[PDB]
Amino acid sequence: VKQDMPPVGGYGPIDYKRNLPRRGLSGYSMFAVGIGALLFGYW
Amino acid sequence: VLRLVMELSGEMVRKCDPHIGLLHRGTEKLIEYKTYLQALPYFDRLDYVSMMCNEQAYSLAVEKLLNIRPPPRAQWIRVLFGEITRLLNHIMAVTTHALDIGAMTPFFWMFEEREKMFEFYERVSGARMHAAYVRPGGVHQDLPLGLMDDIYEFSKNFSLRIDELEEMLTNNRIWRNRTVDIGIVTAEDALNYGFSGVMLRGSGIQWDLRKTQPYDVYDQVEFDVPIGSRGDCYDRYLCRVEEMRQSIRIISQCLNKMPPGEIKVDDAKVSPPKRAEMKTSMESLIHHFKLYTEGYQVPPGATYTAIEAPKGEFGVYLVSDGSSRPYRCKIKAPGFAHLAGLDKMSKGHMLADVVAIIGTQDIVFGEVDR
Amino acid sequence: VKPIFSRDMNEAKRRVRELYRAWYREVPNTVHLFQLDISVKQGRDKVREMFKKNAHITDPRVVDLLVIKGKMELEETIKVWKQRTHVMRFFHETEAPRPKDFLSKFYVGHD
Amino acid sequence: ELLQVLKRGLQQVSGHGGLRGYLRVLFRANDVRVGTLVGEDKYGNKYYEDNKQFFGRHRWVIYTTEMNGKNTFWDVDGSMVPPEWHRWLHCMTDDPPTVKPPTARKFIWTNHKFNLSGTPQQYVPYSTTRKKIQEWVP
Amino acid sequence: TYKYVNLREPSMDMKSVTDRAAQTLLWTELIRGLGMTLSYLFREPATINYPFEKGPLSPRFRGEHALRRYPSGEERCIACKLCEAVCPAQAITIEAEPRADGSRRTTRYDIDMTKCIYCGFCQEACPVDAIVEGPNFEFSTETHEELLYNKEKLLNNGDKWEAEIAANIQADYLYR
Amino acid sequence: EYVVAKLDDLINWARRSSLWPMTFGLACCAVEMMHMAAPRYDMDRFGVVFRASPRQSDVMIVAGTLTNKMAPALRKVYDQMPEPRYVVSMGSCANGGGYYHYSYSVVRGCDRIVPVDIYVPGCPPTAEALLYGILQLQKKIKREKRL
Amino acid sequence: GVRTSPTGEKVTHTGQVYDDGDYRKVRFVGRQKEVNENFAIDLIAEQPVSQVGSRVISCDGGGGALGHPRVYINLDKETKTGTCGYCGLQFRQ
Amino acid sequence: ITVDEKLDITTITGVPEEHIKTRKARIFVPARNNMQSGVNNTKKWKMEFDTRERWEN
Amino acid sequence: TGLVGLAVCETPHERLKILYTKILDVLGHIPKNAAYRKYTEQITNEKLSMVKAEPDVKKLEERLQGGQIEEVILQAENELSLARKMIQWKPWEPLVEEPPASQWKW
Amino acid sequence: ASATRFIQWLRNWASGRDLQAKLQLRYQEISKRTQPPPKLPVGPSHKLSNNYYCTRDGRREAMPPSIVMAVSPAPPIKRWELSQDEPY
Amino acid sequence: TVRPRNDVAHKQLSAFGEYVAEILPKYVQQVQVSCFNELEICIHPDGVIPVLTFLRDHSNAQFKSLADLTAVDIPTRQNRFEIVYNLLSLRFNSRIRVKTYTDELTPIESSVPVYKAANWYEREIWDMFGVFFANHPDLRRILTDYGFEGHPFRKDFPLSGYVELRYDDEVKRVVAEPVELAQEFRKFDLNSPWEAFPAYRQPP
C-alpha cells in the first residue's frame, strides 16, 4: 500500500535566522586593529 | 521580449509606456474549440514557472461548476505541490531579478537546487516542467513511495540553502543602495490598480487570499504572511525571501499530515477510472470512453476563482454552456495588473531603476495572454 | 437617449476630411525618416484606394468608428512604432491575384 | 592528509591502464575515474559504474570504438547504449545483464542503430492514400 | 499571521551606532559576502558529463512516441481514434481500414513533432496501451521531413526501445 | 591535397570547440534554456558561454513561440549575425508550433521566417535533450569545404 | 516479408507501390525508405491455435499488465476458429 | 441629451478581405443522427458556411 | 506610531466628527424619499454614537473599520465625494430608463 | 590539496556552519526503482451495496435563482495578531 | 455525504440581492442573479460610472479593487457583448460582478476616473472585440499587430485568421502577409445527445 510516514525532527527554518556574527564584530575592536596597523606601519 | 518605449527628459524617465503583448499566443480563442480535459495543459503554459500553482486555479474553477469536492488526500497533494511551486516561483523572482541587475553567483546557487526540485516533478509526472497533473478530478496519479522520504530530505538541506541568500544579498551595501526607494507605492491608489500579489501584501495592506478564503484544506496549516512598511523594491524583495522561509513550514506540516486513501474523485462520471478497473467492468470502460472525446457535460453558468499566486492572481472566469466546450474563459494574470503600475512606478526614476521594477514585481511575459 | 460615438450625420464627413488632411501630410515622413520602399506618388495613390472601398456611407456610427480606427492604424506611423518595412505595408506585392472572369478562374481553379 | 589524496590519484592512474591508459581516457572522456565494471554489452561498451562518488552516480558509460561503422574514437555522443539506459544509466537499480534481464519477445532488433542524421538511411514521410482511381481505356 | 519586515532603526547610542557606521567607513559586509562564496568554491561541483554520465529520470517518463505490440507479434493498436480526440495539439492523424482478414487496424498513423506538446494524454487514454512514451531524447534532426513521424513505419521502429518500454510499464499497472 | 584537407579540419574544429549563442527568451522554453547554466547539466564544460554578446554571437537558439509581432524582430537580428551562423529551434513551438499551430497570431514554426539547421523536439526540452542542441550540432559540422 | 516492387522501393504493411509516372519518388533517392522487417499479417498465422475445453473462454494479454479488455468469445461454430477483436489468437472446440 | 437616432441597414466595418461576398451562409438547424435517437443537438440554430476546396497534402 | 499605507501617521480626533456631520447635510438636499438617504443615515449615526462614547480607544478604532484611525478616516474621505456625485447625478429618486430585451439565460 | 579533512575546516570557518548537508547531497537514502509493487486503496465506492448515484448527486444543484429584480456582505475581516514564533 | 460541496453563507449574501435592489433605479439595477455565494448584477450601458462610484468607499459596501474586466461575446442576442466588471472587497472579503450589455457598435461610459487599472483592460476589449469606449485617454492596440485587420476574438471570423502565413520571400527585407493558406483544423463534431440536466430546459 502507498502511504506516507512523517520523519519530522529538523523541520527547517520556522522563521529562524542563521545570520550570526563571525570573526569578531567591529564597534571599537576593529578600529583598534585598523589604527594599530597604521601605528605599526609608520614606526 | 519586452518593447518598453522610453521617454527620457534628460536622464530620468518621465513617460514609460510598456508596449507589451509581444507574446500573444492566442489562448483565448483556441480553448473554445477544446474540451475541459483537453484544454488543461494550456494553463500550465500560461506562466513560465508555475505548474501546480497553475492548473490549480483552473481545476478548482471546474470543481465550482461541477459542485464536486476533491478527496481528502488529493487536497493534501494540492498543498504540498502548491507550496513547492510557491518555492519554485520565488526562485526565479529573485535569481532573474539578480541576473537583470548584474549579479552572477546567486543565479547559479539556486539553479542547482532548482534542478533537484524538478526531480520531484519528474518522479511524480512524465514531463520535466509542464505536468498535466492537477486535474478537474482532483489529482491524476498518486505519489510513489520513494518521494515522501526525499521531500523531507530536501527540506532539511534547504534550510541552509535559503540562508545562503540572506548572508549574501540582503546584507550588501550595493543592494541597500540600489533597491531601496524605487517606486514607493503604499497608497490606496495601489488598491485601484489591484496588484494583489506582492505589491499590496508586501507593503501596508494586510489582506491576502490564503487566510481569508480557504481553497484546499487551509486554517489547519499554519501560516506567517510577511507585510512590509514602504512600497519600495527592497521591502518587496525581503517579504518574498520571508515567504520562501515561511513555506517549508507548510511542506513539513504536509509531511506530518497525509491521510491514506483515494487519489481521484470517487465519482467515475468525472474522474477517469483506474487501468486495472476499466479492463474488466463495462460501466468503467464506457465512462473511460466518454470522459475522453467528450468532456464532462458541465452545468451552464459562470464561475470565478483566484487562488493566490506568488506573482499575483489567476482570476479564471469560465463561461459555460450545456455542451462540453467552454465558450470563452479568461484568466486575468498579474501581468496586466503590474504593467499598469509602471506609469506611476517610473516617474522620477532612472533607466537602471526600471530594470529593478520589472524583476521585483516579477513581470513574466507569459502572463500577458489575456 | 441614444449614443452618437463622436459626430451626428454631417460632422462625421468633416472628420474624414480632417483625417485625409492629416494623412496626406504624413507620406513624406514615411519615406525620408522611415524607408523609401516604393514612391511618394504611389504612397498618395495608396490612400485613395483605401477610401474608395469605404463608399458605403449609411450611418454616423459606422463612419465615426472607422475614423477612430483610422486614428490608430495611420497614427502608428506618426509616432513611429516598430514596423521596419515588414509591417505597415498595406498594398499586396508578394502575391499575384487571379482576375474575375468565367474563362480565367475556371482554367486555374476556383470555387 | 595531503599525501593520502596524492596517493589516491596515483592509484587511480595505475587502475585504468597506466601511462597509455589514463591518457586515452583523459582525451576521449571529460574526466577519468576508477570504479567497478558491468562489462556486458553488444558492441564493447565498458559502462564501469557502481561507485558512490557523488550525486547521481551511475558513472562512466564509455562508448565503443566503431559500434556499427562510425569509428567513434575522437568524436562520440549519446548515440550508443543499447537497451540498458533505463537501468544502468538512469532510473532502475539492478544491472541489466547481471540481475534483471529484459524478457524476450522475438520482435525487437538484435543490433541497435545509431542516431539518424544528415547521413544516408535517414527518416522520410509517406501517406497511406490509395487514391481515387480514374478509368480511361481504348 | 502578521510577520513584519522593517526593524525601524536599531541604532540608539555609541555601541549600536559605531558598528553600523563601521560597515560604511570600511567594508566588512563585502568580506562577509566573500565568505559565503569562498565556502562555495571548496565544495565539489555537481556536474554531469553528458556522453558518459546521465541525469536521473523516472520509471514513467514522456518524451518519445512509439507504439507497442503483443509478445506474439500482432499490432496492438486498434484505430479507435480515441487518442486523436484527446490530443490537445490535434497532432495525431489517423485513417482506419479493415485489413481484409476480419481484424480492424491502422493504415495512416502520423504523429507530427512539429505539433504535440508531449502531454501524455494519448498514453493514458489508450485502452489497449498501444502508445507508451519511451524515455528517449536521441531524435534531433536536420529537416521537418526527418522529424515528423510517418504512418507506423518509424513508430514500429520504436520496437528497438521496447525492451525499456516493457520494463517501464511495470510501474504503470498498479500506479507507482 | 592532404595538407589542405587537414587544414580545413582545423577551421571546422575552431567552431566545434566553441560556440557562442544569442539565446532568445520569449518562451516557457527560456527556463529550460536557463537550465543549461544550472550546474547539474553543465554547458560551460563546452566552449559555450552565457555572455550572449548580440552582435558577436554565432549560433542563435530560437526558443519557443514566435508571434506575428516578434516575426520582423527576430529576422533583423539574424541579418546582423556573422556569416558562420546556425539556428537551433528549441521546443515544439519553434519547430512547427506545438500548441497555437491553428492560432491566428503565431507563425507556424520559425522556418517561414528564419532557416533552421538543428531541431530540438521537446516541449519542456529537457536538459538531456537540449545537449543534442550542442553535441549533435558539433557532430554535424563536417561541411566538406573543398575549394 | 512483403514482395519487392519492380521499380525499386519496398512495399509497406498495405500494398503501396508508387506509380512510374508519379513524381513522389524523389524523397527516397539518396536516403533509404524505412520499412519494418517484421510484418504483422504473417505473425497472426505464425501463432498456433489454442484448444479450449469449455464453451466460452475470455481473452487477455497478461492481466492488467498487458493491455486487453476482457472479451468473451463464443465457440459454437465448428468450421473457422473463433478469434477476439484485439489479438490474432484463435480458439477451437 | 443628444440622441441623434438614425434608422439604416447594418454594415461591416471590422471586416476581412474579399471573401464575404463570394461565400454563402446556410443558417439551418442541425438534423438528428440516424443511429443516435436523442434530441439535444436539435432545437438550436447553427450557421455553418459552405465548404470550399480540399485536397490531400 | 506608523500607518500602514501612504496616509499620514497621525490620529486627528474630532476631524472624523466634522466629516460625518457634514455628509448628513449633503444627503438632505435632493434625496428625501429615496432609500439612499434612508440606508446611509442609519449606518453613519450608528458609528457617530460609538465614536462619541469612546475617545482615543484602540477598541473604538477597531469598530467596523479593522485598521488604524487614519485608515477609517480615509474610508470616509471619499464618502463625501460619493455623496456629492449622488447629488449631481441622481438615480436614487427617479426610475425611467429603458428595460433590456428578454434574453439573459445561458 | 583535495583531502576532505582540511577543506571541511575552511568551509566551516568562512561564514556560517556547514559540514552536514552537502551541495550534491545525493549519497544516502536515495531509493532507486522506487519500491516493490504496491496496492492502491479504494475510496467510499467500490464496495457494493448503497452505492447509488441518487445519493452521490455531484452535478444536480446548479440552477441559479433570480433575486428581487442595512446589510453587510460578510462579518468584517478582523485583523490578525502578530506571529508568536517571530515578532519582526 | 462525501463528494459534494456544502453552502451556508448563501442567505447572508442574498441580502445584497435586496440591498442594492432597494436603491431602485431603472437606470441601474434591471436584473439581479445570485448563485454559489456569488452575485451577478446586469446594468444598463448608459450608467456605468455612477454605478462604480457606488460600491466604492461606501460604508456598507467597500470594494475599492477591480481585479477582472472580462467581456463575453455571444451572437444569440441583439446586444452582442456582455462586459463583466469583476470587483473584489478586501475589507468585507466578498466578490461581486457588474455585468453590462453593448450591441455591435455603441460606446459605453468607461471607468477611467473610477479605476486607474481599467484603461489597460479597456484597450484589450477594443482590440479583441472592437467595443469603443467614450472618455478614454489613449486607446491603443496592444495584443494585435500594428497592421491587423478585424478583431481577433469575434466569433464571425475563423480561428486560423486571414494574414496567418508569413514568408521571407524574393524581397530582401519585407516579410509577406496576405497569403491565406494553412494546414486544416479538424473541427470535431462532438456534442452529446440527450439533455443531462434538469431545471435548465426552457419551453418553446
Ligand SMILES: NC(=O)c1ccc[n+]([C@@H]2O[C@H](COP(=O)([O-])OP(=O)(O)OC[C@H]3O[C@@H](n4cnc5c(N)ncnc54)[C@H](OP(=O)(O)O)[C@@H]3O)[C@@H](O)[C@H]2O)c1
Ligand atoms: N545578370 C547576369 O549576370 C547575366 C546576364 C546574362 C545571362 N546570365 C545567365 O544567367 C545565369 C545566372 O547565374 P549567375 O551568374 O547568377 O550564377 P552565379 O552567381 O555565378 O553562381 C553559380 C552557382 O552555380 C554553381 N555552378 C555553376 N557552374 C557549375 C558547374 N560546372 N559545376 C558545379 N556547380 C556549378 C556554383 O556552385 P559551386 O561554387 O559549388 O560550384 C555557384 O554557386 C548564368 O548561368 C548566365 O548564363 C546572367
Ligand code: SF4
Ligand atoms: S493508439 Fe490506442 S487509443 Fe489510439 S487508435 Fe490505437 S488502440 Fe486506439
Ligand code: SF4
Ligand atoms: S502526448 Fe499529448 S499532444 Fe502529444 S500526441 Fe499524445 S495526446 Fe497529442
Ligand code: SF4
Ligand atoms: S514548446 Fe512548450 S515550453 Fe517551449 S514555448 Fe512552446 S509551450 Fe512553452
Ligand SMILES: [Zn+2]
Ligand atoms: Zn485478445
